[PDB]
Amino acid sequence: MPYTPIDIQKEEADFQKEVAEIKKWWSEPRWRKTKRIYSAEDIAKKRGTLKINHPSSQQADKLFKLLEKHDADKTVSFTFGALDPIHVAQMAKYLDSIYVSGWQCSSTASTSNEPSPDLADYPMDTVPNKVEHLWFAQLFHDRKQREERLTLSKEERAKTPYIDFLRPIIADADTGHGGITAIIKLTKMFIERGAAGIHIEDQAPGTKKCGHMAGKVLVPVQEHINRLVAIRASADIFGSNLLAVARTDSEAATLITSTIDHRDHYFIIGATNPEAGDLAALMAEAESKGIYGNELAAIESEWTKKAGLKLFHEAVIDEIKNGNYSNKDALIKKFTDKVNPLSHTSHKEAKKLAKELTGKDIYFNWDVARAREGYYRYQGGTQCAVMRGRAFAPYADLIWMESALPDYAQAKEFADGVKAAVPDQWLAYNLSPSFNWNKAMPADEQETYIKRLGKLGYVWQFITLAGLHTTALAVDDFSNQYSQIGMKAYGQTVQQPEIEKGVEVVKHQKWSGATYIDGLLKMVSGGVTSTAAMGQGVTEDQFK
Amino acid sequence: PYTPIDIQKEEADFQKEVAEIKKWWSEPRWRKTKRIYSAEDIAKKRGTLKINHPSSQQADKLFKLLEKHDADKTVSFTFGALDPIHVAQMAKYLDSIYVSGWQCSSTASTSNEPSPDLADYPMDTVPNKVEHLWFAQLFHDRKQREERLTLSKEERAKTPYIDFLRPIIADADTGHGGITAIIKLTKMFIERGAAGIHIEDQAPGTKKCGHMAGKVLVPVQEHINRLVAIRASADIFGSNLLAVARTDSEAATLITSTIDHRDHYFIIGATNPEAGDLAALMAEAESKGINELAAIESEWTKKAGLKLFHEAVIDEIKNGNYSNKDALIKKFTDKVNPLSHTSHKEAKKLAKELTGKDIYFNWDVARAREGYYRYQGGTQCAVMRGRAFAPYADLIWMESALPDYAQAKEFADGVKAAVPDQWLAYNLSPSFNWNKAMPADEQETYIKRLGKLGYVWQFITLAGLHTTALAVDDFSNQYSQIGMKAYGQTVQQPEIEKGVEVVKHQKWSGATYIDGLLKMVSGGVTSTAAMGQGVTEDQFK
Amino acid sequence: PYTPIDIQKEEADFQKEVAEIKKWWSEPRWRKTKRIYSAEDIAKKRGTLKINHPSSQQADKLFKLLEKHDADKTVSFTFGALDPIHVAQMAKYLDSIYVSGWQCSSTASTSNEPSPDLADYPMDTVPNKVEHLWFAQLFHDRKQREERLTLSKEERAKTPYIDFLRPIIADADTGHGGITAIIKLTKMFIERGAAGIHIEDQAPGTKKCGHMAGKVLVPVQEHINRLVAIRASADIFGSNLLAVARTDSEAATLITSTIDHRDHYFIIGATNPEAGDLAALMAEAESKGIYGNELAAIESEWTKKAGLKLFHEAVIDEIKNGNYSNKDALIKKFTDKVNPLSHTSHKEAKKLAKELTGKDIYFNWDVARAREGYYRYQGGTQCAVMRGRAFAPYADLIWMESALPDYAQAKEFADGVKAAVPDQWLAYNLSPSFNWNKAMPADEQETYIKRLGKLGYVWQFITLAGLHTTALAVDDFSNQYSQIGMKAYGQTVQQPEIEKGVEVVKHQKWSGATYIDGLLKMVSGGVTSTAAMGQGVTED
Ligand SMILES: [Mg+2]
Numbered sequence A: 001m002p003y004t005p006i007d008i009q010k011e012e013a014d015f016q017k018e019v020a021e022i023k024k025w026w027s028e029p030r031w032r033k034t035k036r037i038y039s040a041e042d043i044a045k046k047r048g049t050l051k052i053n054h055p056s057s058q059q060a061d062k063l064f065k066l067l068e069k070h071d072a073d074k075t076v077s078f079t080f081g082a083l084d085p086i087h088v089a090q091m092a093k094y095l096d097s098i099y100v101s102g103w104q105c106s107s108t109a110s111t112s113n114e115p116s117p118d119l120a121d122y123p124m125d126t127v128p129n130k131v132e133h134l135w136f137a138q139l140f141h142d143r144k145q146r147e148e149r150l151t152l153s154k155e156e157r158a159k160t161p162y163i164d165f166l167r168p169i170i171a172d173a174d175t176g177h178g179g180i181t182a183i184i185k186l187t188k189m190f191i192e193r194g195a196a197g198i199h200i201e202d203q204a205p206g207t208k209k210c211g212h213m214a215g216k217v218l219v220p221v222q223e224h225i226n227r228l229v230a231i232r233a234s235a236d237i238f239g240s241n242l243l244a245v246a247r248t249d250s251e252a253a254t255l256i257t258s259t260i261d262h263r264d265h266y267f268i269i270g271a272t273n274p275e276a277g278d279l280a281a282l283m284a285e286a287e288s289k290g291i292y293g294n295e296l297a298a299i300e301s302e303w304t305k306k307a308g309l310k311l312f313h314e315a316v317i318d319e320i321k322n323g324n325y326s327n328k329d330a331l332i333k334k335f336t337d338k339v340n341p342l343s344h345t346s347h348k349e350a351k352k353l354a355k356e357l358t359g360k361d362i363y364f365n366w367d368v369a370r371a372r373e374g375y376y377r378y379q380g381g382t383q384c385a386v387m388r389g390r391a392f393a394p395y396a397d398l399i400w401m402e403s404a405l406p407d408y409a410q411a412k413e414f415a416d417g418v419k420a421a422v423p424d425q426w427l428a429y430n431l432s433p434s435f436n437w438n439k440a441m442p443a444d445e446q447e448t449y450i451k452r453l454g455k456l457g458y459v460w461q462f463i464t465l466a467g468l469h470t471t472a473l474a475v476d477d478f479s480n481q482y483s484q485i486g487m488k489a490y491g492q493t494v495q496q497p498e499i500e501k502g503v504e505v506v507k508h509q510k511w512s513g514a515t516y517i518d519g520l521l522k523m524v525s526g527g528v529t530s531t532a533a534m535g536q537g538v539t540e541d542q543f544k
Numbered sequence B: 001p002y003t004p005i006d007i008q009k010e011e012a013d014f015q016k017e018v019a020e021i022k023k024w025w026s027e028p029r030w031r032k033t034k035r036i037y038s039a040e041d042i043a044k045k046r047g048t049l050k051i052n053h054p055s056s057q058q059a060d061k062l063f064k065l066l067e068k069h070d071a072d073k074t075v076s077f078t079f080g081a082l083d084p085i086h087v088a089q090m091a092k093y094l095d096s097i098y099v100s101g102w103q104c105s106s107t108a109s110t111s112n113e114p115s116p117d118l119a120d121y122p123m124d125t126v127p128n129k130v131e132h133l134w135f136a137q138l139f140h141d142r143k144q145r146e147e148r149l150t151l152s153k154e155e156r157a158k159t160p161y162i163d164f165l166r167p168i169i170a171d172a173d174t175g176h177g178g179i180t181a182i183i184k185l186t187k188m189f190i191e192r193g194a195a196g197i198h199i200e201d202q203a204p205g206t207k208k209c210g211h212m213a214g215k216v217l218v219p220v221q222e223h224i225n226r227l228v229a230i231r232a233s234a235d236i237f238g239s240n241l242l243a244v245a246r247t248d249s250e251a252a253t254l255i256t257s258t259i260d261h262r263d264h265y266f267i268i269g270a271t272n273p274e275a276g277d278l279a280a281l282m283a284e285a286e287s288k289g290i291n292e293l294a295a296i297e298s299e300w301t302k303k304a305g306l307k308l309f310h311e312a313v314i315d316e317i318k319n320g321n322y323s324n325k326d327a328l329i330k331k332f333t334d335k336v337n338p339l340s341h342t343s344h345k346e347a348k349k350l351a352k353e354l355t356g357k358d359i360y361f362n363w364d365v366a367r368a369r370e371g372y373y374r375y376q377g378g379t380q381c382a383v384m385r386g387r388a389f390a391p392y393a394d395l396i397w398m399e400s401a402l403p404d405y406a407q408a409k410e411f412a413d414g415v416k417a418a419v420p421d422q423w424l425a426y427n428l429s430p431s432f433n434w435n436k437a438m439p440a441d442e443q444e445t446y447i448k449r450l451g452k453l454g455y456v457w458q459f460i461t462l463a464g465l466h467t468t469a470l471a472v473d474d475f476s477n478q479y480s481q482i483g484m485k486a487y488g489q490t491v492q493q494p495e496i497e498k499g500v501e502v503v504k505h506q507k508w509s510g511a512t513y514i515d516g517l518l519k520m521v522s523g524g525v526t527s528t529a530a531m532g533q534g535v536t537e538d539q540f541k
Numbered sequence C: 001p002y003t004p005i006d007i008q009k010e011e012a013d014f015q016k017e018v019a020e021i022k023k024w025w026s027e028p029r030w031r032k033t034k035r036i037y038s039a040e041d042i043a044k045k046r047g048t049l050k051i052n053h054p055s056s057q058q059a060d061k062l063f064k065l066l067e068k069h070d071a072d073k074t075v076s077f078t079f080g081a082l083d084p085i086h087v088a089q090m091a092k093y094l095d096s097i098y099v100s101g102w103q104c105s106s107t108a109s110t111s112n113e114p115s116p117d118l119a120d121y122p123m124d125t126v127p128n129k130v131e132h133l134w135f136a137q138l139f140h141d142r143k144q145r146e147e148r149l150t151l152s153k154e155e156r157a158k159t160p161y162i163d164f165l166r167p168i169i170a171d172a173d174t175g176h177g178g179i180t181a182i183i184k185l186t187k188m189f190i191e192r193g194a195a196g197i198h199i200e201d202q203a204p205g206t207k208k209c210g211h212m213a214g215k216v217l218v219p220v221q222e223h224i225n226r227l228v229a230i231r232a233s234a235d236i237f238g239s240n241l242l243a244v245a246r247t248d249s250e251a252a253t254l255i256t257s258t259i260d261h262r263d264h265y266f267i268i269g270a271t272n273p274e275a276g277d278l279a280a281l282m283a284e285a286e287s288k289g290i291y292g293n294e295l296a297a298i299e300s301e302w303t304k305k306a307g308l309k310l311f312h313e314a315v316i317d318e319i320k321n322g323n324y325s326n327k328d329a330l331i332k333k334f335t336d337k338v339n340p341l342s343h344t345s346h347k348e349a350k351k352l353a354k355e356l357t358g359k360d361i362y363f364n365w366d367v368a369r370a371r372e373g374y375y376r377y378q379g380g381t382q383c384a385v386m387r388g389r390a391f392a393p394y395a396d397l398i399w400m401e402s403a404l405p406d407y408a409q410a411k412e413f414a415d416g417v418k419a420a421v422p423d424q425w426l427a428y429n430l431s432p433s434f435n436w437n438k439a440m441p442a443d444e445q446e447t448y449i450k451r452l453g454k455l456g457y458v459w460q461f462i463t464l465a466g467l468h469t470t471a472l473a474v475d476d477f478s479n480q481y482s483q484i485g486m487k488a489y490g491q492t493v494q495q496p497e498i499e500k501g502v503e504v505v506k507h508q509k510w511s512g513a514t515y516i517d518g519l520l521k522m523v524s525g526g527v528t529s530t531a532a533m534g535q536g537v538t539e540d
């Protein structure tokens, strides 16, 4: 009684069966460029006795094929950040994918209902819940529309247009909201709640900024790789072709949590002056004696000038330039050809070479330049981002570099840089409203900007905050009119325009799925019911 | 501006699906399942994207499990689980699992606001509770599979197996509103791991526990429509979800309408023409600022001579100028009785033929102030409603005020006479005092005995509540008296001796499972391993 | 169209509020509470609309309750509650209530996805669990007041009173992210009925249970800032919320940064110049597809060669095996200046070692780093005292996780902390992660709490007791149930419930049926046909 018996032979057989099924799965064309560091054995062991098929995975497939065709045609899947079921329902007419924004979720959709700026400090399940919000709306309107169609004749169907409500969703996972085990659980939720793809950034959690905020802290290249692996591990266990997007904030970031990773060393800023002591501790000693405010910032600005902060290669070049060396231009090139952004040369190794080339132990101390929190100083730009792009590419179906402006040149630099080493890598671009767009570009360029980036291989592009702003404009404008001119504002500003532009929602009972539900009502009540919602009396005969 | 489609492929796929549904419905699972809509009707309700809810597999597992029990005339017996701990330990011993609405009211409302069993928590409360347990089952299944498959074949065969994935049957109360509500409620239950749900012929605004008083019923048809609506939902979203129909008509004394002919036999009315509207009489007395009021009711009731119409017909004949009286009752009783579905107009017509009176009967006047009609159910009323629900319901269930074998037999026999292959379910309620109601020898065999009558699923609704309540109160008492000795003595030693898996709680909670995931992702090795050297569970070896 | 405002009244109200806060902060409750911001700073953070969270009253109740316990040298002892049933029965016997993160991981995640104690459920999980219990407490308090006040004065005095409203102390783990996270987490805890919350100096998303292994610490200052952030939140939203500081430094072996001078003593490094970067050596071996236990072989080899120790161990070692006179006396020059509590930075300690020996004694803690980048760390009880003292200004209770229930160690830590902060309340985990019949005999068990009470551990809790009592009870009954049917329920549960006076066996009354019938009749003008506890109910 007290337990359940099992056939031990059938157990092994089923295990082996599954291992093979996974191996076959992984051999599909979808995974052609997808590096996995674990075995199918490793994954099968993690699964349970009961297989579950998450429909989100079908939208992953739909997304991958959709992006394949776009890459082949050198054209773009362009979308923006959806707020709510209304957005996805109207978007589906025009666009072929859908972005769920963490920024927008912070302000409008936290599960504690407590809003914030884009700090990813809402509870973990916030964006996953937002996807389900939209997912389930998509599914509902798809269900509504199918009934509307199939209660028409074949003759009538062919007249009435079709909306594909089921546009694949790509959702913000921020920095993964904690460790590896967190990221697995976060991914699990995203899969369960209808995510076609999720993106994830090489920032430290709980210093997490928007892409165009300041004071961004990075994590070691490997640490963020492990994040991407962890997503994949989760998707492999629970059986989704979930797309993974890797984001780097290293264009603009000035800080990093550790020096542990050799790839980062080139970019870690340090002091060239032996006399400079620990800035962190110097500030602490000045603060404890009640120096505060702008007189304290004086001591920093003094220490920084004295410390001579730079990247180690700048320091090597500086030694050679101002030094007793015969053939200087040629001697920098010996160093720069071996040691550069992409070259992955550790610091020990780069010092060793500098010694060979100059005969000095050139002094360099990046411990002393640390911030009070302990972060190391860091000088990324586009080339740093390429370095990290390349590193992530094996693990990531799309690659994405946050930029401070909508600069074509920079976008090309990054695209070219990445594709040189991984030419088949899909890229993604933030079309951010954090840019002033009429200040940055004339309108002729605006019109073609997406297309142009499409050529460089940015197959997925999104305006992160467009849903926020369209809504914000619309509601403010109407509220203003409403306050001035009463119900005329509604006739004039909203409802007439809705009719003229063919917007489906103005017939809002039908749109909301009333005739769909009347179907379910009659069906259950044996064909007929006295409480029919769209029967004689409904006030939508005023819209015919 | 839109998306184009092949209109021909549309129709083709539609037709494909209609056929798939027809084939589905023809499976042995649906052998007794009446459907009042077509496969066409259902396919039209579905979307373009098929979704497979794993809950449905647990429905299958539950059905087969109950099939075998019915065939062997034995019982799947379980009780009301509170939380992941319960299901994890229950899975060792029991083969199904009950999620109680009563318990959810007190312990698991989604607003966190507790209550007595009134089903006035938010609708998603029990569906969320199932997912609570569902996901725990799935997790511990996942944990255990890793533990096993990292052992050798030699070692596996030594270590026992737990089937964590016991099918869940969950309280849907009265469906928490109209038909559209019930569809949406069922959808959630399917999505969140329900193998089966049960649903009761009470009115929603007034929903009681089964062993509370003042229970209001709904018309037979109305509750049938509820069951149909569940089935409609399960059909659309593609689950073999089991439906359980409950009737509270054993004890209930009120009903919302007289509209349904089947109910008429049981609707109580006044035999005295002189009695006026009780409701309005009370209202007039209250508005003049009148226990003295309850006096006016108790007077009106005696004067009104309340009874069932057949009692009134029998009474007329008995105390009447009629020659062959016993034989004249039987003419009426054979045609008009609990199971006979005879409307009131029809029963009056016959009474006129048999006596020559329009025997006076007014059930409007006996109405409660809220408007409910008065109602006298018992076990035979419940059989009537059982039979009515049976076509629409995989299990049938009659709430009882006591654990009475005779009554249980009466109801089982009564239902099976008309539907002999109908599975039955029985509440083994802690609302009964069980040592007062029978001796312990009978207690031991009570489930088995009901199994013979065909009660294939039985549950103690509130057992999880009470075991926990005892355990925590007892330990808290000890704890307060003799400190940490209470824990060594009352809990942790017993845990070791009884082999309870949770005392090694790091392992039980799935730490070694997650360390697996951690190492796997970190390329085989990691410095932050949770069950590495240092963990204090080497004190349990 | 905007709204106008009196600019003068604005300033006046601002100033009014600043003063109200200053007065608040001067109350006896904050006598030991260091604040690094002004009342100005806080008032600016508040809105125009004052909100009073009832949780704060339970904070007061908790503080006074602990005051009296400290004065009497006795203990508020409790354990980890699962659900409304627990708090309702606990309230009879105990005077505070613990909400466990460990238990929440397994039983109460808001995604419904369970786990081991990794604090990787969503942030709102424990806050939601407090509200679960909070609202139950409030409900049963409300039920009981109606029951009492519908009795006569004569009858009231016969029927016993339960204080359902026992203050709740809840697990905040490591705060679930940065400072802004911790503010938001604290806000929720206040809104949802937390009397106090506790918080640990581990790194987030490596977060372990206290008695799991591979624990990573954060710099002393970083965890101080966490405690400040709690206080900042409680100050803004106006709770006397108690803050508990936990340190996992007894057992922890890793730390995220070396930035904080206080930590330096405890940071482990390599004494062998020849040892190169372990991290990078592992990375090169991994990228060639060495994995698993053969990789851990390369580590175990490198570690032996590297000669890992604390810098002072290295200084002592140099002097001991060295050409020095007066060796014993020369260690003491160093140890008296440089030790666990002495806060001596590494540069400073090397400088002294040079003065005392004339070597730059080699020490490299960068090379011993784990692959994730963590530095190696050797805490014990003295490290924990160091951190206790550091946290004490910011924390109403102090708490050191221990691997065993060892009296000596508990005394060491209590004495150590109170030496520098003698009025500091302490808290102790009475963990079921210990085997308790293996660790001590039963005579000692009975008195163990009391004895720790003397040392000043005013709040003690069994973290996982709710889990285990329930686990035993359900497993045992399920077993019986399966063996002897309904007899098991009569015998194992319901009879015992009657005999032990447990209130819940009359479960309709307990659940508040007669309370709600009250509300029903009241609204229906005195009378109703659908009364839940009328004639017919089976509780007669
Ligand atoms: Mg965002």
Ligand SMILES: [Mg+2]
Pocket (backbone or CB within 6 Å): B100, B101, B102, B103, B117, B171, B209
């Ligand atoms: Mg119930």
Ligand SMILES: [Mg+2]
Pocket (backbone or CB within 6 Å): C100, C101, C102, C117, C171, C173
């Ligand atoms: Mg905890």
